[PDB]
Design goal:
Number of strands of chain A: 10
PDB class: hydrolase
Entry title: Structure of atypical asparaginase from Rhodospirillum rubrum (mutant K19Q)
Structural class of chain A: alpha/beta
CATH architecture of chain A: 3-Layer(aba) Sandwich
Strand content of chain A: 25-35%
Bound molecules: chloride ion
Shape of chain A: globular
Radius of gyration of chain A: 15 Å
Chains A, B, C, D: Asparaginase
Oligomer: homotetramer
CATH superfamily of chain A: L-asparaginase, N-terminal domain
Number of domains of chain A: 1
CATH class of chain A: Alpha Beta
Largest interface: A-B, 38 and 39 residues
Helix content of chain A: 25-40%
Keywords: Asparaginase, wild type, atypical, enzyme, hydrolase
Assembly: tetrameric
Chain lengths: 165, 172, 165, 172
Amino acid sequence: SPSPLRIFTAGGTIDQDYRLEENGLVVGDPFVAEVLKTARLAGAVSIVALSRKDSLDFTEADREAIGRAVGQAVEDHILLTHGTDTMVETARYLGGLPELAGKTVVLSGAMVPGRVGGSDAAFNIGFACAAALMLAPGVYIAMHGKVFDPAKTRKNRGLGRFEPI
Amino acid sequence: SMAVSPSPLRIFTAGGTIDQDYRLEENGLVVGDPFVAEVLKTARLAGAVSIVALSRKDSLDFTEADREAIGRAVGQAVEDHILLTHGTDTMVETARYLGGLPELAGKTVVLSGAMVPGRVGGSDAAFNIGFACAAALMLAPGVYIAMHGKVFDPAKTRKNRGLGRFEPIDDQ
Amino acid sequence: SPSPLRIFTAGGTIDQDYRLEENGLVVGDPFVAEVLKTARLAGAVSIVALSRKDSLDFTEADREAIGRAVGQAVEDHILLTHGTDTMVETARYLGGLPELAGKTVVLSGAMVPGRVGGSDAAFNIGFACAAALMLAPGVYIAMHGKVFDPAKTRKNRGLGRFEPI
Amino acid sequence: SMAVSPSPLRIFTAGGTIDQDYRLEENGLVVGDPFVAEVLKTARLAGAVSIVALSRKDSLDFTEADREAIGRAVGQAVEDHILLTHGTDTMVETARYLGGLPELAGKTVVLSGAMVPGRVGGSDAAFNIGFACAAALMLAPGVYIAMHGKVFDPAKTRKNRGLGRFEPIDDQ
Ligand SMILES: [Cl-]
Ligand SMILES: [Cl-]
């Protein structure tokens, strides 16, 4: 085989881990690296860290910086792992950038941290890798085993899911 | 009417390494329950996926009659998006057989599985299930093998039994 | 085989699990039950739920109620899973009760939730079950692969461990 | 002087089910690295435990010379608290052999392992390691089998190979 994939990590629930110092969860090392370590991949992949912030902390300036970072990739297939709180805001922002118009850009993450039992993360990473390879140029959210149009999607905080508007 | 989430994907299971589990009686691994069901249980799916168990035979007892039954089951499915979980040692033989059924011509059929049992630590299984579900939804009609985070053409693929990987057969 | 063991669950980090509604960890179902399900035990065990409170929330009245509950057990071998924040306070309280003087009472738990990767919980449960069977009547803390005297122990919050005073 | 945490327990590993792991080459389980090390890595121990790997032989290739080497290693240890991880099919034979060595008379020696490999989901291994570490520290000198959350007298124990459990031999 497939086209080279570049993966950017912006934090989120997917990456949370337990720390004794905080007596709870903190954004830790990118879980996507753990998943891809055992995926026995054939194709070229590179993983780059952007952020470990809470996605609620992202400003417009942070989304502009994420846009420029995705634009630094020569790869035309991109996965961004991200928190679900503001995944829609980032995805809509990227979808408006003429500079990304040739790329397939998929945002994903997890509702349950990858390091907690019963997580969606590994499935979501496989699904989102396929989506980043196979979908036409555009910006997408891949969650819940489907592909969402960011312009027509919202995060339901109370129900812990993405849904059509 | 209130929105109904479609369920475009059906899954069939034929066993293989992906489903192996330890049994005290055998003092070893046997083909267990379908591991794909465990992965989808926690995937928080928007739709549902019907998972239909076809066979758990050991690779050695898996016959041509068994492959026929798989082709009947895939062709009879209403869904046009199909994932078959299967052993890797004869996945190419099953994929090639399904590619020859004209009844499958409008369906996207993806075969997948795992090199390491899902119930053993460090398994490729969950990644492979996520990737193969997407592939079965997104690829054009045809028969494919989805492994190692890529798509293989069954007519141009072999299994390297030593290394536990699929490899392309290069054109000459 | 061994003498019957009664296990009481009072919550704590050991039992924490991720909930979408809280966007974080909450005290969930007792992890000791998950561990003992696969331990293939020969002996008689019964598990009883007392509390799912944060151990910091326990009052003197709650510790008196825990004492009376342990006293309702005919078993002379007792494990109490508990949060580490006030495990010493509960253990010292129980150690002062003449009514428990014939029982072996062991408190344990985990520094990392059992449902998070890399947890101490399963090891701690095996160790603490053995301790509850094998130690002389008394009240003990079993953590870090050793047995602590509650009267001579403190929880180091900053270092996430129990240590001699 | 500032307090030094003693390390009263030494661990020896002789393989067994507890250590089995999946290998692509064998298309199956082999005796892998010592799983006891994985469990103790995350136990947040106050002391340290030296873990000494003695053997990984398949039960079939495990010989009387191999049992002798285990008795030499346990007797030469400075520690008087010893846990040996081992296969369950011949744990009673090894335990009985060690019980006959006068050099072991002041040591508490516990044998343990797992019915299900540590690297397979749903394994007894971590519980068994915690329980057997405590047992090796708390029991009086002697040789014991610690499994199923209890202590077995090797002279009065058999393995039920069908059920994957140790059972007492009742006195008559
Ligand atoms: Cl938290
Ligand atoms: Cl095997």
